[PDB]
Amino acid sequence: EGPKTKFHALMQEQIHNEFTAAQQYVAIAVYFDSEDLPQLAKHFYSQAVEERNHAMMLVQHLLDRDLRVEIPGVDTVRNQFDRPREALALALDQERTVTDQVGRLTAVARDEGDFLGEQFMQWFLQEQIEEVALMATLVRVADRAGANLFELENFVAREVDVAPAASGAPHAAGGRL
Amino acid sequence: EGPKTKFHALMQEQIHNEFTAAQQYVAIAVYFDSEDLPQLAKHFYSQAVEERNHAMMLVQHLLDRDLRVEIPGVDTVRNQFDRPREALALALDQERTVTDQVGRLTAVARDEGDFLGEQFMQWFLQEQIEEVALMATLVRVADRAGANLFELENFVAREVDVAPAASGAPHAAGGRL
Amino acid sequence: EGPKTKFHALMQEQIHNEFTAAQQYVAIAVYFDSEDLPQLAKHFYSQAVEERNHAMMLVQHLLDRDLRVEIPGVDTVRNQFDRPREALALALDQERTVTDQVGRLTAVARDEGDFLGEQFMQWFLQEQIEEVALMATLVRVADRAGANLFELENFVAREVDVAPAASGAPHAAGGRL
Amino acid sequence: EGPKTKFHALMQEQIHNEFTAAQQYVAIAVYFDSEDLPQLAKHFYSQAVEERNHAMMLVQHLLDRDLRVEIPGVDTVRNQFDRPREALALALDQERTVTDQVGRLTAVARDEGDFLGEQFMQWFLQEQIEEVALMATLVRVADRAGANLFELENFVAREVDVAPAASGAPHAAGGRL
Amino acid sequence: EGPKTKFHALMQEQIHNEFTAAQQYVAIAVYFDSEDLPQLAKHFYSQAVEERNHAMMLVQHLLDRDLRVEIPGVDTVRNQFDRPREALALALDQERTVTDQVGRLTAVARDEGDFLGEQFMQWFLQEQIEEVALMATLVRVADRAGANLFELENFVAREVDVAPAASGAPHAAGGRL
Amino acid sequence: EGPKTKFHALMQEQIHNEFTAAQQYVAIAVYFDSEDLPQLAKHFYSQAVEERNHAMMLVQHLLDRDLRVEIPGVDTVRNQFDRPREALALALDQERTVTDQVGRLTAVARDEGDFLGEQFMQWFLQEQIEEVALMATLVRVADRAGANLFELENFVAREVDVAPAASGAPHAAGGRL
C-alpha cells in the first residue's frame, strides 16, 4: 500500500487519541451537567470543542503533506464518577498523557529527520503548557473546596475564562471551531 | 440500577448513532479534501458539525428529563472510496437510515405513551425532510456530472448553501455550534 | 409507473384542492371589488396569495421526498353572489372543508406510518385554527352589520390585519410570496 | 343578462388563457425543480408570478369599465417532459401563442371602435416583445448546450435577470406581485 | 346547551388548573419574599406570569374554535411552608402534575380525532420539558445547599435566567405578558 | 398565632377581593372577545392586568410591614351575559363596590390609628376616581349606542386610551405589569 515512516504511523494514532480525548471531555461535561454544575460543564463543553479542533489540525497536517489519513472510531469513554474531584482528576490525568504523547511525537520526528513534523508540533507543546496548568489549578481548587461545590463553581466562573485563541494556531480541517 | 423504558433505551442507541454519523461525515469530508474537491469538503465539514449538534440535542433532552445518559464510543467508519459518487451515495444511504431510525423512535414513543418523547422528535423529522432532499439532489447531480467533477463542484458552490439555522431547534448540550 | 402509497395519492388531491381554493378566493375578492368593498377585497386578495403559498408548500414537500407531483388544473369556481354575507359564508365553508381535509391527511399519514408526512402537516393544522377563527369572526360581524355594509368595512379595516408571517412555515416552492 | 360586445367576450377568454398560462409555467418550473436545474426553476417561478399578474391586470381592466368578469377554472396543463429542451420549447410556443392572442384582441378592439380597449393592450404587446425574445434566447442556448445542462444553467444564472419592472404597467387587481 | 366533546370538556378543566397553578406560584413567591430570598422570589413572580400566559393561551384556543369557555374561580392554594426546600418541592410536584395533565389532553384529543386539538398542545409538551428540568435542578440545588440558603440564592442569580421567549408560542388572549 | 388588628384582617379580605375582581375582568373581556368586540376586549384585558397589579400592591404592603399574608383562592365569577350593556354594567357595579371597600379600609385604618395604613390607600382612592369615571362613561355610551355596537367600538378605539401609568403608584410585589 506504500512505505509508512513511523512519524506518519504514530501521528495517525495521535489523531485517534485526540478524538477519544474529545469524547471523554464531552462525557465529563455531561456528568457535570447532570450534577448541576453548569460553569464547570460550560468549561468542559468548550474543552471538547478545543480537543476536536486539535484532532482536525492533525488531520489537516496529514492532508497537506499528502499522506493517507484515516478518520478512526473512538473507544468507550468513562461516564461513572462518584464525586466531581474524580472527573477533574481524570481530565488532569488525560492532559498529562496528551503532553507525554506529543513529546513522543516530537521525539520520533526528530529521530527520523522529519523537519516539517518536528516543527508542526511546537504549537501543541505550547498548548499543553497552559492546558495542563489550567487543569492542575482546577484539581487543586476542587481539593480546597472539598464537598462545598459552590466555591469551585464561583472560582470557575470568575477566574477561568476561555479567552479568544491567539494566532500561531495551524489550520484545522474544516475551519477551527 | 433502575427501570428503563424502551424509549429511553433506544434513544441512548440513537445518541450512539448520531455520533457515528458525525464521524462518518468527517471521514467523507476528509476523502473529499484529499481528492481536491473543497466545496464538497466544505459542505460535509458543515454537515458533521450539524450531526454533532443533533447528538448534543438528544443528550440535552436526556439531561432535561433526568434520565441517565452515556456518552458512547464510535464504531470504525468508512474511509476508502474509489470515486466521489460512492461517498455521496454513502451519505444519502446514511441519511435514509437516520430517517428510518427517527421514525422508529417516534413510533416507540407513541406506543409507550411518552408524550414528551413523541413531541421532542418532530423537529428531527422536519430536519430529515430537507436533509435527505439535499443529499438526493447531490447524488443525482453527481450522476449527471459523471467523471467531470468540476460541474458538481460548481453546483455545490452556487446552489447548495448552509443558510442560518431557523428557530424551533431544541437546545443542544453545550450550545449549538 | 411505480407504487403509490395513499398518503402520496391523497396529497396530490390536496394540491389540487389548495389551487382551487386559491382561485375561489380570487373570485370572492373580485366580487367584493366589483361591489365597492375594497377592504374586504384587499383581505381576500391577500388570502388568495396565502392559499397559493400553501399549494406551493405542498408541492415543495413532494419535490423534497422525490415523489412525482402533477401541477393540476382548477375546477370552475363560483362568481355569482346575491349579497356579501353569502360570499363570506362560502369562504367560511371552504375553510372548514380545508380543515377537515388536512385532518384526513394527518389521519392517513398516521395510519400508513409516514412519519415525515405526519410531521409536515402540523403547520397546516396550526394555520387552520387561526384561519377558520378569522373567517367565522367575519361572518358573525357581517350578520351584525346586516345591510349596512360600511360597518363591516370599518371592522375589516381597523381590526383584521395580515401581520408578518411567523416562522415555522415550511419552504414553499419558488419562494413564499 | 345584458349585451356583450365581442371585445368583452374575448377578453374574458384571454383572462382564462393567462390563468392557464400561469399554471403551465408553474408546471414547467416544477419539472425543472425535480430535475435539479434550480436557476431555470427560479426563472420560471418568477414567470408564473408575472403571468398571474397579467391575468390580474386584465381582471382589473374589466372591473374598471364595470363589465361583468368571471374568474374561471384552469385546464389541465402538461407535466411530462422527456428532456429540458422540450419544456423550454413549450414555453416558447406558449408565448408565441400569447402574442398572437393579444394581437387578436387589439384587432377586435380596433374593429368595434373600443378605444379604451385598443389603448389598454399596447402594454401587453410591449411585454410580449421582450418576453418572446427571452424565451427564444433560452431555447437556442438549450440547443447549443445539448445534453450538457450545466452550461445552460450558468447562462441563466449570469445573463438572464428579472430586473425591477418598469412603469407603464397598468394596475393589477390586488396589487402587482 | 349543546353537545360537548370531552376534549373540550377536559380543556376547560385544564384552564381551571393553569389558573390555580398561577395562584400557587404567586403564593410560593410571596413565601420566598417574606423569608428574604428575593432572587428565588423574582424567579417565581416570573413563573406566575408565565402560567397565567399559558391559561390565556388555552382560553384563546377555545375562543378561536368558537367553543364556549368559562373563566373559572381558583381553589385555595398553599401558603404555609416550614422551610424553602418544601416550597420548591411543591413547585416541582405541580409541574410534574401539569406534564401528566397535558399528556392526558394530547391522549384524549388523539382518541376523539381532534386534530387541531392534538396539534395545539405540542407547544405545551415542549414547554413542560424545559420547565420540569428547571424545577428539578432547583430542588437538587436546594438539597446540596441545605440550611445555607445564600448558595441557593447565588445559583438562582447567576445560572437561572428567564431568557426572551422563543417563537412557536401560540397567541394568548389579551396579549402574552 | 399572633394578635391581628382589624386593619390587617380586612386588608387580607381586600387582597381576596382584588384577585376576584381581576378574574371577573378577565371573564368580561373573554365574553367581549367571543362576541367580536375586540377594542372593548382589549380595554378589559388591560383592566384585568391593572387589577392584578393592585392586588400585588396590597400584598407588597403586607410584606413590607412584616404581617402574615395569604394568597387566597378566587370565587366563581360571572360568564353569562345576554347583551354587552349588562357586562359593562357589571364592571361599573364592581368598581363602585371597590370604591366603597377602599373607603371602608381608610375608615378602619383611621379608627385604629394605623397611620401607615391610612396613608397607603390614598393612592387607591385616587385610582378609584378615574376608574369609576371611565366605567360610567362606557356604560352611558353603551346606552346611547343601543343595539348598534360599532359606535361603542369606535368610541372605545378613539377616546379611551390606557396612557402610561403616572408615578405615585406604590411598589407591586413582583414588579408592576
Domain count, chain D: 1
| Cβ-based interface (< 8 Å): residues of E facing B | 99, 102-103, 106-107, 122, 125-126, 128-130, 132-133, 136, 166-168
The three three-digit cell numbers of residue E139, written as one number? 430542588
Does residue C71 lie within any of the structural domains?
yes
Question: C-alpha distances in angstroms, D79 versus C72, D30, D76?
Answer: 9, 8, 9
User: Measured between CA atoms, how close is D154 to chain B, in angstroms?
Assistant: 9
Residue D118 CB neighbours (<10 A): 18
User: Measured between CA atoms, how close is C100 to chain F, in angstroms?
Assistant: 23
Which residues does chain B have within 8 Å of residue E107's beta carbon, measured at their own beta carbons? 113, 115
**Contact of chains C and F by CB distance (3 or more pairs under 8 angstroms):** yes
Distance from C-alpha of E32 to C-alpha of E44, rounded to nearest angstrom: 9
Distance from C-alpha of F155 to C-alpha of C12, rounded to nearest angstrom: 50
Does residue B170 lie within any of the structural domains?
no
A63 in Cβ contact with B33 (< 8 Å): yes
Which residues does chain C have within 8 Å of residue E113's beta carbon, measured at their own beta carbons? 103, 107
Does residue E170 lie within any of the structural domains?
no
Best of C92, C153, C159, C160 to disrupt the F interface by mutation (most F CBs within 10 Å)?
Answer: C159
In chain C, what is the greatest distance between 2 CA atoms, to the nearest angstrom?
57
Does residue E169 lie within any of the structural domains?
no
CA nearest neighbour of C132 among E66, E173, E112? E66
User: Measured between CA atoms, how close is C35 to chain F, in angstroms?
Assistant: 22
**Contact of chains A and D by CB distance (3 or more pairs under 8 angstroms):** no
Q: Do E69 and F30 touch (CB under 8 A)?
A: yes
| Cβ-based interface (< 8 Å): residues of E facing C | 61, 63-66, 113, 115-116, 118-120, 122, 167-168, 170-171
Tell the residue number behind the cell numbers 461545590, with chain if given.
Answer: A149
Q: Is F157 helix (H, G, I), strand (E, B) or coil?
A: helix
Q: Is C74 helix (H, G, I), strand (E, B) or coil?
A: strand
**Chains A, E: CB pairs < 8 Å:** 16
CA nearest neighbour of D125 among D113, D139, D107? D107
Q: Do D157 and B158 touch (CB under 8 A)?
A: yes
Which residues does chain A have within 8 Å of residue B2's beta carbon, measured at their own beta carbons? none
The three three-digit cell numbers of residue C140, written as one number? 358573525
User: Measured between CA atoms, how close is D33 to chain B, in angstroms?
Assistant: 10
Which residues does chain F have within 8 Å of residue C144's beta carbon, measured at their own beta carbons? 36, 149-150
Which residues does chain A have within 8 Å of residue E141's beta carbon, measured at their own beta carbons? 36
**CA torsion C107→C112→C113→C118, rounded to 10°?**
-30
- In the chain, the amino acid numbered A117 is G
What is the Cα A123 distance to its own chain's centre?
13
Burial bucket for residue D78 (CB in 10 Å: 0-12, 13-18, 19+): middle
Residue A110 CB neighbours (<10 A): 13
Q: Can you give the length of chain B in residues?
A: 177
Distance from C-alpha of A23 to C-alpha of B52, rounded to nearest angstrom: 11
Which residues does chain A have within 8 Å of residue E154's beta carbon, measured at their own beta carbons? 150, 154
Residue ranges in chain C assigned as alpha helix (H) = 6-34, 38-64, 84-111, 115-120, 122-145, 149-158
Residue F31 neighbours by CB under 8 Å, 6+ apart:
F79, F81, F87
Q: Do C66 and B136 touch (CB under 8 A)?
A: yes
Does residue D167 lie within any of the structural domains?
no
F6 in Cβ contact with F67 (< 8 Å): no
Sign of CA dihedral D46, D52, D55, D61: negative
Distance from C-alpha of D39 to C-alpha of A90, rounded to nearest angstrom: 54
Q: Is D54 annotated as a binding residue?
A: yes
Tell the residue number behind the cell numbers 495542563, with chain if given.
Answer: A132
Tell the residue number behind the cell numbers 438539597, with chain if given.
Answer: E143
DSSP label of D74: B
Helices C84-111 and C122-145 cross at an angle (nearest 10°) of: 160
In order, the DSSP letters of B79-105 are: ---SSHHHHHHHHHHHHHHHHHHHHHH
Q: Can you give the length of chain D in residues?
A: 177
H/E/C letters for each residue in chain A?
A: CCCCCHHHHHHHHHHHHHHHHHHHHHHHHHHHHHCCCHHHHHHHHHHHHHHHHHHHHHHHHHHHCCCCCCCCCECCCCCCCCCHHHHHHHHHHHHHHHHHHHHHHHHHHHHCCCHHHHHHCHHHHHHHHHHHHHHHHHHHHHHHHCCCHHHHHHHHHHCCCCCCCCCCCCCCCCCCC
Residue E63 exposure: Cα atoms within 13 Å on the Cβ side:
27
CA nearest neighbour of B142 among B89, B101, B65, B79? B89
Residue B46 CB neighbours (<10 A): 17
Q: Is D130 annotated as a binding residue?
A: no
- Domain, as residue range, for A126: 1-177
The three three-digit cell numbers of residue B155, written as one number? 453546483
Tell the residue number behind the cell numbers 437510515, with chain if given.
Answer: B97
Domain of E73, CATH number, reads 1.20.1260.10
Residue A20 neighbours by CB under 8 Å, 6+ apart:
A74, A75, A77, B73
Residue E154 CB neighbours (<10 A): 17
CA nearest neighbour of F68 among B39, B125, E35, A44? E35
Among the partner-chain residues C30, C73, C76, the one whose CB lies closest to the CB of D77 is C73
Q: Which chains pack against F, by 3+ Cβ pairs within 8 A?
A: C, E
Distance from C-alpha of F93 to C-alpha of F132, rounded to nearest angstrom: 9
Phi/psi for B89 (5° steps) reads -65, -35
CA nearest neighbour of C73 among F140, D23, B164, A76? D23
DSSP label of C165: P
Does residue C60 lie within any of the structural domains?
yes
